[PDB]
Amino acid sequence: MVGQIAKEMGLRAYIVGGVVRDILLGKEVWDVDFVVEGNAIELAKELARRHGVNVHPFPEFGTAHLKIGKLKLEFATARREPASLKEDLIRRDFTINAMAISVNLEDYGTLIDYFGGLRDLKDKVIRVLHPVSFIEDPVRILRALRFAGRLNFKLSRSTEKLLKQAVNLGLLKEAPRGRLINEIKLALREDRFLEILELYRKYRVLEEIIEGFQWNEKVLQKLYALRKVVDWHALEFSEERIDYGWLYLLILISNLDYERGKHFLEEMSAPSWVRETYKFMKFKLGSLKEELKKAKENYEVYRLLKPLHTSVLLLLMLEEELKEKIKLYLEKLRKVKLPKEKIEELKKELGERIEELKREIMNK
Ligand SMILES: Nc1ncnc2c1ncn2[C@@H]1O[C@H](COP(=O)(O)OP(=O)(O)OP(=O)(O)O)[C@@H](O)[C@H]1O
Ligand SMILES: [Mg+2]
């Protein structure tokens, strides 16, 4: 694979970063990151050569990206931004991300841990490499929590102190906006994203990001309830799955004004249906809940929930009194079908009579 060419080219290549951590944690990963002492670009192009695949070079970044099957390989030259592996490693964020495993033939299968990344790994501890790490790259403030959210890891004393410092220093607000938005977009893709929100509330990061944002108990409660509803729905219908991460985000921004909220969602590069759910949540949701509680017949609820998005209904299952109604619509009302002969007798305006018969049968 690599070590052959690394030996033939006299270079030294290493599997580096999150991939190594995932391997140690027994995680399946098809995305592989390499750091090389040598010329990594030529090594990558020669790998792509021998394998006969296509290689995208990046002279500016001094890196190369090549894909074999659905497996993606990124090769990078060791750099301090020559530079030894250690110097390339210490510039990264955390200890568990700071390790490497050699693919070179002599040392193959050797985990190289300078900073005790394995020590901090087994202790479930997120730890920065250097004391200025948060000031250096503010994104890490969020990142740590995310990892701490994902793996259920605790922040070390030093790390927590530095993090709280950098947060109180407000460096988060003066951080590059794009990278922050990216980190947030990556955070919501987590299944542990709710716990990440717990850490967010704990260290108050969102208050330093979004305009006029604060925390109250009702939002948190509706977030737990949201987790319940999401778990139940994901349990019942496996083919109806959507992205639930945005729903929590819509819960958080619920109390905020429409203008800045819309601007924020457009700033997040959010999907259509999400922002549509937001606009529908602001204005039309109140009268929706009103007329929903005012519905005597099941068919009326069917008519009301028919044009609605599924996410809107899932969001509507948060109400206790509306639970059985939503569950009824999902598991019964919308599954109703008809025979042939009846349609033929109706044909001797069509959809009207169809909805009429729907009204007839769905009330049983
Ligand atoms: N903001 C950052 N500061 C320093 N190093 C970083 C930063 N972001 C990523 N890295 C380094 O890049 C490597 C992989 O990048 P990435 O941000 O995808 O993290 P990851 O471990 O791959 O997370 P995931 O497995 O969830 O994708 C990490 O091991 C880390 O050392
Ligand atoms: Mg990765």
mmCIF file of all heavy atoms in Angstrom, residues 246-292:
data_model
loop_
_atom_site.group_PDB
_atom_site.id
_atom_site.type_symbol
_atom_site.label_atom_id
_atom_site.label_comp_id
_atom_site.label_asym_id
_atom_site.label_seq_id
_atom_site.Cartn_x
_atom_site.Cartn_y
_atom_site.Cartn_z
ATOM 1 N N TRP A 246 -31.457 19.698 12.681
ATOM 2 C CA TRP A 246 -31.967 21.036 12.414
ATOM 3 C C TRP A 246 -33.140 21.379 13.325
ATOM 4 O O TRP A 246 -33.369 22.547 13.632
ATOM 5 C CB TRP A 246 -32.392 21.170 10.949
ATOM 6 C CG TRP A 246 -31.267 21.005 9.970
ATOM 7 C CD1 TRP A 246 -30.988 19.898 9.222
ATOM 8 C CD2 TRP A 246 -30.272 21.980 9.631
ATOM 9 N NE1 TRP A 246 -29.883 20.123 8.439
ATOM 10 C CE2 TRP A 246 -29.423 21.393 8.672
ATOM 11 C CE3 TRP A 246 -30.015 23.291 10.046
ATOM 12 C CZ2 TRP A 246 -28.337 22.071 8.121
ATOM 13 C CZ3 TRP A 246 -28.936 23.961 9.497
ATOM 14 C CH2 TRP A 246 -28.112 23.351 8.545
ATOM 15 N N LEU A 247 -33.879 20.358 13.751
ATOM 16 C CA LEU A 247 -35.059 20.558 14.589
ATOM 17 C C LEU A 247 -34.697 21.195 15.925
ATOM 18 O O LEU A 247 -35.365 22.124 16.382
ATOM 19 C CB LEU A 247 -35.783 19.232 14.822
ATOM 20 C CG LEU A 247 -36.238 18.491 13.564
ATOM 21 C CD1 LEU A 247 -37.071 17.272 13.933
ATOM 22 C CD2 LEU A 247 -37.015 19.418 12.642
ATOM 23 N N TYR A 248 -33.636 20.686 16.544
ATOM 24 C CA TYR A 248 -33.123 21.254 17.783
ATOM 25 C C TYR A 248 -32.731 22.712 17.570
ATOM 26 O O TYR A 248 -33.027 23.577 18.398
ATOM 27 C CB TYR A 248 -31.926 20.445 18.292
ATOM 28 C CG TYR A 248 -32.232 18.981 18.523
ATOM 29 C CD1 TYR A 248 -32.038 18.044 17.518
ATOM 30 C CD2 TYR A 248 -32.714 18.537 19.746
ATOM 31 C CE1 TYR A 248 -32.318 16.703 17.725
ATOM 32 C CE2 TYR A 248 -32.998 17.202 19.963
ATOM 33 C CZ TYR A 248 -32.798 16.288 18.950
ATOM 34 O OH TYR A 248 -33.080 14.958 19.163
ATOM 35 N N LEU A 249 -32.076 22.975 16.441
ATOM 36 C CA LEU A 249 -31.648 24.324 16.089
ATOM 37 C C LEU A 249 -32.848 25.259 15.955
ATOM 38 O O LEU A 249 -32.778 26.431 16.325
ATOM 39 C CB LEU A 249 -30.840 24.304 14.789
ATOM 40 C CG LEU A 249 -30.217 25.626 14.329
ATOM 41 C CD1 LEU A 249 -29.254 26.165 15.377
ATOM 42 C CD2 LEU A 249 -29.514 25.456 12.988
ATOM 43 N N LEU A 250 -33.948 24.731 15.430
ATOM 44 C CA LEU A 250 -35.178 25.503 15.302
ATOM 45 C C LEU A 250 -35.830 25.713 16.664
ATOM 46 O O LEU A 250 -36.509 26.716 16.886
ATOM 47 C CB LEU A 250 -36.154 24.814 14.346
ATOM 48 C CG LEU A 250 -35.705 24.700 12.886
ATOM 49 C CD1 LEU A 250 -36.777 24.030 12.040
ATOM 50 C CD2 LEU A 250 -35.350 26.068 12.326
ATOM 51 N N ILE A 251 -35.621 24.766 17.574
ATOM 52 C CA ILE A 251 -36.130 24.899 18.936
ATOM 53 C C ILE A 251 -35.397 26.020 19.666
ATOM 54 O O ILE A 251 -36.009 26.812 20.384
ATOM 55 C CB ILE A 251 -35.985 23.585 19.737
ATOM 56 C CG1 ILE A 251 -36.915 22.509 19.176
ATOM 57 C CG2 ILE A 251 -36.310 23.812 21.206
ATOM 58 C CD1 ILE A 251 -38.381 22.795 19.417
ATOM 59 N N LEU A 252 -34.084 26.089 19.466
ATOM 60 C CA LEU A 252 -33.264 27.092 20.136
ATOM 61 C C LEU A 252 -33.606 28.516 19.696
ATOM 62 O O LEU A 252 -33.639 29.435 20.512
ATOM 63 C CB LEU A 252 -31.782 26.815 19.884
ATOM 64 C CG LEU A 252 -31.294 25.431 20.316
ATOM 65 C CD1 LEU A 252 -29.814 25.260 20.013
ATOM 66 C CD2 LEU A 252 -31.578 25.195 21.790
ATOM 67 N N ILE A 253 -33.872 28.687 18.405
ATOM 68 C CA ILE A 253 -34.109 30.012 17.836
ATOM 69 C C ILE A 253 -35.583 30.412 17.886
ATOM 70 O O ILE A 253 -35.967 31.460 17.364
ATOM 71 C CB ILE A 253 -33.622 30.082 16.376
ATOM 72 C CG1 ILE A 253 -34.451 29.149 15.491
ATOM 73 C CG2 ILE A 253 -32.145 29.728 16.291
ATOM 74 C CD1 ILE A 253 -33.972 29.085 14.057
ATOM 75 N N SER A 254 -36.399 29.568 18.510
ATOM 76 C CA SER A 254 -37.844 29.777 18.580
ATOM 77 C C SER A 254 -38.237 31.104 19.231
ATOM 78 O O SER A 254 -39.155 31.781 18.767
ATOM 79 C CB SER A 254 -38.501 28.621 19.339
ATOM 80 O OG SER A 254 -37.960 28.494 20.643
ATOM 81 N N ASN A 255 -37.542 31.472 20.302
ATOM 82 C CA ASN A 255 -37.873 32.684 21.043
ATOM 83 C C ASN A 255 -37.384 33.952 20.342
ATOM 84 O O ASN A 255 -37.895 35.046 20.592
ATOM 85 C CB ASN A 255 -37.291 32.609 22.456
ATOM 86 C CG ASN A 255 -37.747 31.372 23.210
ATOM 87 O OD1 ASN A 255 -37.195 30.285 23.033
ATOM 88 N ND2 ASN A 255 -38.757 31.532 24.058
ATOM 89 N N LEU A 256 -36.397 33.798 19.465
ATOM 90 C CA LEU A 256 -35.807 34.929 18.753
ATOM 91 C C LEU A 256 -36.704 35.479 17.646
ATOM 92 O O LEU A 256 -37.625 34.808 17.182
ATOM 93 C CB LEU A 256 -34.451 34.537 18.165
ATOM 94 C CG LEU A 256 -33.318 34.426 19.185
ATOM 95 C CD1 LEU A 256 -31.980 34.254 18.487
ATOM 96 C CD2 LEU A 256 -33.305 35.649 20.086
ATOM 97 N N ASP A 257 -36.415 36.711 17.232
ATOM 98 C CA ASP A 257 -37.177 37.387 16.187
ATOM 99 C C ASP A 257 -37.016 36.690 14.840
ATOM 100 O O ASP A 257 -36.066 35.937 14.629
ATOM 101 C CB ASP A 257 -36.745 38.851 16.068
ATOM 102 C CG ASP A 257 -36.971 39.634 17.348
ATOM 103 O OD1 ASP A 257 -37.847 39.238 18.145
ATOM 104 O OD2 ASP A 257 -36.276 40.652 17.553
ATOM 105 N N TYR A 258 -37.953 36.945 13.933
ATOM 106 C CA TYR A 258 -37.948 36.293 12.629
ATOM 107 C C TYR A 258 -36.834 36.793 11.711
ATOM 108 O O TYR A 258 -36.265 36.015 10.952
ATOM 109 C CB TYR A 258 -39.297 36.475 11.931
ATOM 110 C CG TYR A 258 -39.301 35.964 10.506
ATOM 111 C CD1 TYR A 258 -39.394 34.604 10.238
ATOM 112 C CD2 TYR A 258 -39.200 36.839 9.431
ATOM 113 C CE1 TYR A 258 -39.391 34.130 8.940
ATOM 114 C CE2 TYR A 258 -39.195 36.374 8.130
ATOM 115 C CZ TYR A 258 -39.292 35.018 7.892
ATOM 116 O OH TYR A 258 -39.290 34.549 6.599
ATOM 117 N N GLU A 259 -36.539 38.088 11.764
ATOM 118 C CA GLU A 259 -35.545 38.681 10.869
ATOM 119 C C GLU A 259 -34.146 38.104 11.087
ATOM 120 O O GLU A 259 -33.530 37.561 10.164
ATOM 121 C CB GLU A 259 -35.510 40.203 11.041
ATOM 122 C CG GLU A 259 -36.724 40.936 10.478
ATOM 123 C CD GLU A 259 -37.956 40.815 11.358
ATOM 124 O OE1 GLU A 259 -37.839 40.292 12.487
ATOM 125 O OE2 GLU A 259 -39.044 41.246 10.920
ATOM 126 N N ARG A 260 -33.655 38.218 12.317
ATOM 127 C CA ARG A 260 -32.316 37.749 12.657
ATOM 128 C C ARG A 260 -32.229 36.224 12.628
ATOM 129 O O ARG A 260 -31.163 35.662 12.378
ATOM 130 C CB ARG A 260 -31.903 38.280 14.031
ATOM 131 C CG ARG A 260 -32.889 37.962 15.142
ATOM 132 C CD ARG A 260 -32.600 38.780 16.386
ATOM 133 N NE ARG A 260 -33.542 38.484 17.461
ATOM 134 C CZ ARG A 260 -33.647 39.196 18.579
ATOM 135 N NH1 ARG A 260 -32.870 40.253 18.767
ATOM 136 N NH2 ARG A 260 -34.533 38.854 19.505
ATOM 137 N N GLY A 261 -33.354 35.561 12.881
ATOM 138 C CA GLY A 261 -33.412 34.110 12.838
ATOM 139 C C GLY A 261 -33.314 33.591 11.418
ATOM 140 O O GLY A 261 -32.589 32.634 11.140
ATOM 141 N N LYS A 262 -34.056 34.227 10.517
ATOM 142 C CA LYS A 262 -33.997 33.916 9.096
ATOM 143 C C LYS A 262 -32.606 34.200 8.551
ATOM 144 O O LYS A 262 -32.047 33.395 7.805
ATOM 145 C CB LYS A 262 -35.044 34.721 8.322
ATOM 146 C CG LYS A 262 -34.788 34.802 6.825
ATOM 147 C CD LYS A 262 -35.755 35.763 6.153
ATOM 148 C CE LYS A 262 -35.351 36.035 4.713
ATOM 149 N NZ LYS A 262 -34.000 36.657 4.624
ATOM 150 N N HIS A 263 -32.053 35.349 8.928
ATOM 151 C CA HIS A 263 -30.694 35.702 8.537
ATOM 152 C C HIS A 263 -29.690 34.660 9.026
ATOM 153 O O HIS A 263 -28.739 34.321 8.321
ATOM 154 C CB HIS A 263 -30.320 37.084 9.076
ATOM 155 C CG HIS A 263 -28.848 37.348 9.082
ATOM 156 N ND1 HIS A 263 -28.058 37.185 7.965
ATOM 157 C CD2 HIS A 263 -28.020 37.755 10.073
ATOM 158 C CE1 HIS A 263 -26.807 37.485 8.266
ATOM 159 N NE2 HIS A 263 -26.756 37.834 9.538
ATOM 160 N N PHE A 264 -29.915 34.152 10.234
ATOM 161 C CA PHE A 264 -29.036 33.146 10.820
ATOM 162 C C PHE A 264 -29.128 31.813 10.086
ATOM 163 O O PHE A 264 -28.111 31.174 9.819
ATOM 164 C CB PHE A 264 -29.367 32.947 12.301
ATOM 165 C CG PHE A 264 -28.669 31.771 12.923
ATOM 166 C CD1 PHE A 264 -27.331 31.850 13.275
ATOM 167 C CD2 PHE A 264 -29.351 30.589 13.160
ATOM 168 C CE1 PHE A 264 -26.687 30.770 13.847
ATOM 169 C CE2 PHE A 264 -28.712 29.506 13.732
ATOM 170 C CZ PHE A 264 -27.379 29.598 14.076
ATOM 171 N N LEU A 265 -30.349 31.391 9.770
ATOM 172 C CA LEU A 265 -30.556 30.128 9.068
ATOM 173 C C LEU A 265 -30.009 30.195 7.646
ATOM 174 O O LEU A 265 -29.493 29.207 7.124
ATOM 175 C CB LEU A 265 -32.039 29.757 9.049
ATOM 176 C CG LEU A 265 -32.639 29.357 10.398
ATOM 177 C CD1 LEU A 265 -34.073 28.891 10.226
ATOM 178 C CD2 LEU A 265 -31.798 28.277 11.058
ATOM 179 N N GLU A 266 -30.126 31.364 7.024
ATOM 180 C CA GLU A 266 -29.548 31.584 5.705
ATOM 181 C C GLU A 266 -28.028 31.649 5.807
ATOM 182 O O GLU A 266 -27.314 31.361 4.845
ATOM 183 C CB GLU A 266 -30.099 32.866 5.077
ATOM 184 C CG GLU A 266 -31.564 32.780 4.672
ATOM 185 C CD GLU A 266 -32.100 34.089 4.122
ATOM 186 O OE1 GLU A 266 -31.514 35.150 4.427
ATOM 187 O OE2 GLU A 266 -33.106 34.055 3.382
ATOM 188 N N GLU A 267 -27.542 32.024 6.987
ATOM 189 C CA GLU A 267 -26.110 32.069 7.259
ATOM 190 C C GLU A 267 -25.569 30.661 7.503
ATOM 191 O O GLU A 267 -24.381 30.396 7.313
ATOM 192 C CB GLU A 267 -25.833 32.971 8.464
ATOM 193 C CG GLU A 267 -24.366 33.191 8.781
ATOM 194 C CD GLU A 267 -24.170 34.059 10.007
ATOM 195 O OE1 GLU A 267 -25.183 34.515 10.581
ATOM 196 O OE2 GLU A 267 -23.005 34.284 10.399
ATOM 197 N N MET A 268 -26.458 29.760 7.913
ATOM 198 C CA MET A 268 -26.095 28.378 8.211
ATOM 199 C C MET A 268 -26.126 27.484 6.975
ATOM 200 O O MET A 268 -25.791 26.300 7.056
ATOM 201 C CB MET A 268 -27.031 27.802 9.278
ATOM 202 C CG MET A 268 -26.639 28.128 10.711
ATOM 203 S SD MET A 268 -25.339 27.048 11.341
ATOM 204 C CE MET A 268 -26.158 25.455 11.284
ATOM 205 N N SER A 269 -26.529 28.054 5.841
ATOM 206 C CA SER A 269 -26.719 27.297 4.604
ATOM 207 C C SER A 269 -27.663 26.123 4.847
ATOM 208 O O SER A 269 -27.387 24.994 4.444
ATOM 209 C CB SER A 269 -25.381 26.801 4.048
ATOM 210 O OG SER A 269 -24.547 27.888 3.684
ATOM 211 N N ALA A 270 -28.772 26.405 5.524
ATOM 212 C CA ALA A 270 -29.752 25.383 5.870
ATOM 213 C C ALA A 270 -30.607 25.002 4.664
ATOM 214 O O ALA A 270 -30.841 25.827 3.781
ATOM 215 C CB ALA A 270 -30.633 25.868 7.014
ATOM 216 N N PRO A 271 -31.072 23.743 4.623
ATOM 217 C CA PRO A 271 -31.956 23.258 3.557
ATOM 218 C C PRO A 271 -33.277 24.024 3.483
ATOM 219 O O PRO A 271 -33.655 24.700 4.440
ATOM 220 C CB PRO A 271 -32.200 21.796 3.944
ATOM 221 C CG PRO A 271 -30.998 21.420 4.737
ATOM 222 C CD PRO A 271 -30.639 22.650 5.512
ATOM 223 N N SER A 272 -33.954 23.918 2.342
ATOM 224 C CA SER A 272 -35.225 24.600 2.101
ATOM 225 C C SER A 272 -36.272 24.322 3.178
ATOM 226 O O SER A 272 -36.728 25.239 3.865
ATOM 227 C CB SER A 272 -35.779 24.201 0.732
ATOM 228 O OG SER A 272 -35.961 22.799 0.647
ATOM 229 N N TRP A 273 -36.657 23.055 3.305
ATOM 230 C CA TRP A 273 -37.708 22.633 4.230
ATOM 231 C C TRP A 273 -37.478 23.087 5.672
ATOM 232 O O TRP A 273 -38.431 23.262 6.429
ATOM 233 C CB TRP A 273 -37.851 21.112 4.194
ATOM 234 C CG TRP A 273 -36.599 20.391 4.584
ATOM 235 C CD1 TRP A 273 -35.568 20.037 3.763
ATOM 236 C CD2 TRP A 273 -36.241 19.940 5.896
ATOM 237 N NE1 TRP A 273 -34.591 19.392 4.481
ATOM 238 C CE2 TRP A 273 -34.980 19.319 5.793
ATOM 239 C CE3 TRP A 273 -36.864 20.000 7.147
ATOM 240 C CZ2 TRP A 273 -34.331 18.761 6.894
ATOM 241 C CZ3 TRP A 273 -36.217 19.445 8.238
ATOM 242 C CH2 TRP A 273 -34.964 18.835 8.104
ATOM 243 N N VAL A 274 -36.216 23.267 6.052
ATOM 244 C CA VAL A 274 -35.884 23.747 7.390
ATOM 245 C C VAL A 274 -36.365 25.185 7.583
ATOM 246 O O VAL A 274 -37.109 25.486 8.520
ATOM 247 C CB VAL A 274 -34.365 23.682 7.660
ATOM 248 C CG1 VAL A 274 -34.066 24.045 9.108
ATOM 249 C CG2 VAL A 274 -33.824 22.301 7.333
ATOM 250 N N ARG A 275 -35.937 26.065 6.684
ATOM 251 C CA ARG A 275 -36.308 27.473 6.741
ATOM 252 C C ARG A 275 -37.803 27.661 6.506
ATOM 253 O O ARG A 275 -38.416 28.581 7.054
ATOM 254 C CB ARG A 275 -35.497 28.278 5.723
ATOM 255 C CG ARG A 275 -34.043 28.473 6.130
ATOM 256 C CD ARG A 275 -33.231 29.183 5.058
ATOM 257 N NE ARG A 275 -32.842 28.288 3.971
ATOM 258 C CZ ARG A 275 -31.900 28.566 3.075
ATOM 259 N NH1 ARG A 275 -31.242 29.716 3.135
ATOM 260 N NH2 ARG A 275 -31.612 27.692 2.122
ATOM 261 N N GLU A 276 -38.387 26.786 5.693
ATOM 262 C CA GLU A 276 -39.830 26.793 5.484
ATOM 263 C C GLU A 276 -40.543 26.424 6.779
ATOM 264 O O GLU A 276 -41.581 26.998 7.117
ATOM 265 C CB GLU A 276 -40.225 25.830 4.363
ATOM 266 C CG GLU A 276 -39.729 26.245 2.987
ATOM 267 C CD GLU A 276 -40.151 25.276 1.899
ATOM 268 O OE1 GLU A 276 -40.656 24.184 2.236
ATOM 269 O OE2 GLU A 276 -39.980 25.609 0.707
ATOM 270 N N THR A 277 -39.972 25.465 7.503
ATOM 271 C CA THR A 277 -40.515 25.048 8.789
ATOM 272 C C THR A 277 -40.390 26.186 9.795
ATOM 273 O O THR A 277 -41.224 26.330 10.684
ATOM 274 C CB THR A 277 -39.798 23.796 9.340
ATOM 275 O OG1 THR A 277 -39.687 22.809 8.307
ATOM 276 C CG2 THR A 277 -40.566 23.212 10.520
ATOM 277 N N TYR A 278 -39.345 26.994 9.643
ATOM 278 C CA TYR A 278 -39.135 28.147 10.513
ATOM 279 C C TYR A 278 -40.188 29.225 10.252
ATOM 280 O O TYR A 278 -40.845 29.705 11.183
ATOM 281 C CB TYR A 278 -37.724 28.712 10.316
ATOM 282 C CG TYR A 278 -37.344 29.815 11.282
ATOM 283 C CD1 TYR A 278 -37.465 29.638 12.655
ATOM 284 C CD2 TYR A 278 -36.839 31.026 10.822
ATOM 285 C CE1 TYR A 278 -37.112 30.642 13.542
ATOM 286 C CE2 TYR A 278 -36.479 32.035 11.701
ATOM 287 C CZ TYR A 278 -36.618 31.838 13.060
ATOM 288 O OH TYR A 278 -36.264 32.837 13.939
ATOM 289 N N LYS A 279 -40.347 29.594 8.983
ATOM 290 C CA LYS A 279 -41.335 30.596 8.592
ATOM 291 C C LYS A 279 -42.747 30.159 8.966
ATOM 292 O O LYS A 279 -43.572 30.977 9.375
ATOM 293 C CB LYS A 279 -41.261 30.876 7.089
ATOM 294 C CG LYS A 279 -42.282 31.898 6.606
ATOM 295 C CD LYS A 279 -42.225 32.088 5.099
ATOM 296 C CE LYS A 279 -43.263 33.101 4.639
ATOM 297 N NZ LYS A 279 -43.244 33.292 3.162
ATOM 298 N N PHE A 280 -43.020 28.866 8.827
ATOM 299 C CA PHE A 280 -44.329 28.333 9.173
ATOM 300 C C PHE A 280 -44.506 28.273 10.687
ATOM 301 O O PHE A 280 -45.622 28.382 11.195
ATOM 302 C CB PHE A 280 -44.526 26.945 8.562
ATOM 303 C CG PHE A 280 -45.967 26.547 8.415
ATOM 304 C CD1 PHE A 280 -46.641 26.773 7.226
ATOM 305 C CD2 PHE A 280 -46.646 25.950 9.464
ATOM 306 C CE1 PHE A 280 -47.966 26.409 7.086
ATOM 307 C CE2 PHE A 280 -47.972 25.586 9.329
ATOM 308 C CZ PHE A 280 -48.633 25.817 8.138
ATOM 309 N N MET A 281 -43.398 28.103 11.403
ATOM 310 C CA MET A 281 -43.426 28.033 12.860
ATOM 311 C C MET A 281 -43.717 29.397 13.472
ATOM 312 O O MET A 281 -44.458 29.501 14.451
ATOM 313 C CB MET A 281 -42.101 27.488 13.401
ATOM 314 C CG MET A 281 -42.063 27.301 14.911
ATOM 315 S SD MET A 281 -40.530 26.543 15.487
ATOM 316 C CE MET A 281 -39.336 27.803 15.049
ATOM 317 N N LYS A 282 -43.119 30.438 12.902
ATOM 318 C CA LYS A 282 -43.322 31.798 13.397
ATOM 319 C C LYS A 282 -44.792 32.230 13.375
ATOM 320 O O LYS A 282 -45.400 32.446 14.424
ATOM 321 C CB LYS A 282 -42.480 32.790 12.591
ATOM 322 C CG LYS A 282 -40.977 32.572 12.712
ATOM 323 C CD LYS A 282 -40.511 32.623 14.162
ATOM 324 C CE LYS A 282 -40.696 34.006 14.769
ATOM 325 N NZ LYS A 282 -40.224 34.056 16.182
ATOM 326 N N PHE A 283 -45.355 32.353 12.177
ATOM 327 C CA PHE A 283 -46.695 32.911 12.008
ATOM 328 C C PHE A 283 -47.825 31.894 12.169
ATOM 329 O O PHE A 283 -48.626 31.977 13.100
ATOM 330 C CB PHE A 283 -46.820 33.568 10.628
ATOM 331 C CG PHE A 283 -45.854 34.694 10.396
ATOM 332 C CD1 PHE A 283 -44.671 34.481 9.709
ATOM 333 C CD2 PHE A 283 -46.136 35.971 10.855
ATOM 334 C CE1 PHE A 283 -43.783 35.517 9.489
ATOM 335 C CE2 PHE A 283 -45.252 37.012 10.639
ATOM 336 C CZ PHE A 283 -44.074 36.784 9.954
ATOM 337 N N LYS A 284 -47.877 30.939 11.248
ATOM 338 C CA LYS A 284 -49.057 30.102 11.055
ATOM 339 C C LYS A 284 -49.218 28.960 12.062
ATOM 340 O O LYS A 284 -50.237 28.269 12.054
ATOM 341 C CB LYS A 284 -49.036 29.528 9.636
ATOM 342 C CG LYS A 284 -48.709 30.563 8.567
ATOM 343 C CD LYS A 284 -48.520 29.921 7.202
ATOM 344 C CE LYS A 284 -48.049 30.939 6.174
ATOM 345 N NZ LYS A 284 -49.005 32.072 6.035
ATOM 346 N N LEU A 285 -48.226 28.760 12.924
ATOM 347 C CA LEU A 285 -48.241 27.622 13.843
ATOM 348 C C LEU A 285 -49.281 27.755 14.956
ATOM 349 O O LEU A 285 -49.884 26.765 15.370
ATOM 350 C CB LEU A 285 -46.856 27.422 14.461
ATOM 351 C CG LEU A 285 -46.710 26.214 15.391
ATOM 352 C CD1 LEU A 285 -47.014 24.923 14.645
ATOM 353 C CD2 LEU A 285 -45.322 26.170 16.009
ATOM 354 N N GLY A 286 -49.480 28.975 15.445
ATOM 355 C CA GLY A 286 -50.424 29.221 16.521
ATOM 356 C C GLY A 286 -51.849 28.847 16.155
ATOM 357 O O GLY A 286 -52.499 28.066 16.856
ATOM 358 N N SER A 287 -52.334 29.405 15.050
ATOM 359 C CA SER A 287 -53.674 29.099 14.563
ATOM 360 C C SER A 287 -53.772 27.636 14.148
ATOM 361 O O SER A 287 -54.852 27.045 14.168
ATOM 362 C CB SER A 287 -54.044 30.006 13.388
ATOM 363 O OG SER A 287 -55.359 29.734 12.933
ATOM 364 N N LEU A 288 -52.635 27.059 13.770
ATOM 365 C CA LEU A 288 -52.568 25.645 13.429
ATOM 366 C C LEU A 288 -52.874 24.787 14.650
ATOM 367 O O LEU A 288 -53.686 23.866 14.581
ATOM 368 C CB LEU A 288 -51.192 25.289 12.863
ATOM 369 C CG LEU A 288 -50.968 23.821 12.498
ATOM 370 C CD1 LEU A 288 -51.916 23.395 11.388
ATOM 371 C CD2 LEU A 288 -49.520 23.583 12.097
ATOM 372 N N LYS A 289 -52.224 25.097 15.769
ATOM 373 C CA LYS A 289 -52.466 24.390 17.024
ATOM 374 C C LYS A 289 -53.891 24.627 17.512
ATOM 375 O O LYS A 289 -54.548 23.710 18.017
ATOM 376 C CB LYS A 289 -51.464 24.829 18.093
ATOM 377 C CG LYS A 289 -50.014 24.528 17.757
ATOM 378 C CD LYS A 289 -49.082 25.016 18.853
ATOM 379 C CE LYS A 289 -49.207 26.518 19.054
ATOM 380 N NZ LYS A 289 -48.250 27.022 20.080
ATOM 381 N N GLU A 290 -54.358 25.864 17.357
ATOM 382 C CA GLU A 290 -55.731 26.228 17.699
ATOM 383 C C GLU A 290 -56.735 25.333 16.980
ATOM 384 O O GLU A 290 -57.492 24.596 17.612
ATOM 385 C CB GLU A 290 -55.997 27.696 17.357
ATOM 386 C CG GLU A 290 -57.455 28.121 17.492
ATOM 387 C CD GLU A 290 -57.964 28.046 18.919
ATOM 388 O OE1 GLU A 290 -57.823 29.043 19.657
ATOM 389 O OE2 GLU A 290 -58.513 26.992 19.303
ATOM 390 N N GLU A 291 -56.734 25.406 15.652
ATOM 391 C CA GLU A 291 -57.669 24.641 14.833
ATOM 392 C C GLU A 291 -57.438 23.131 14.928
ATOM 393 O O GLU A 291 -58.331 22.343 14.618
ATOM 394 C CB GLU A 291 -57.578 25.100 13.377
ATOM 395 C CG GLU A 291 -57.928 26.568 13.182
ATOM 396 C CD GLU A 291 -57.650 27.055 11.776
ATOM 397 O OE1 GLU A 291 -57.113 26.269 10.968
ATOM 398 O OE2 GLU A 291 -57.965 28.227 11.479
ATOM 399 N N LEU A 292 -56.243 22.729 15.354
ATOM 400 C CA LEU A 292 -55.954 21.315 15.568
ATOM 401 C C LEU A 292 -56.645 20.818 16.831
ATOM 402 O O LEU A 292 -57.198 19.718 16.854
ATOM 403 C CB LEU A 292 -54.447 21.067 15.660
ATOM 404 C CG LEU A 292 -54.006 19.615 15.850
ATOM 405 C CD1 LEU A 292 -54.583 18.731 14.757
ATOM 406 C CD2 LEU A 292 -52.488 19.516 15.874
#
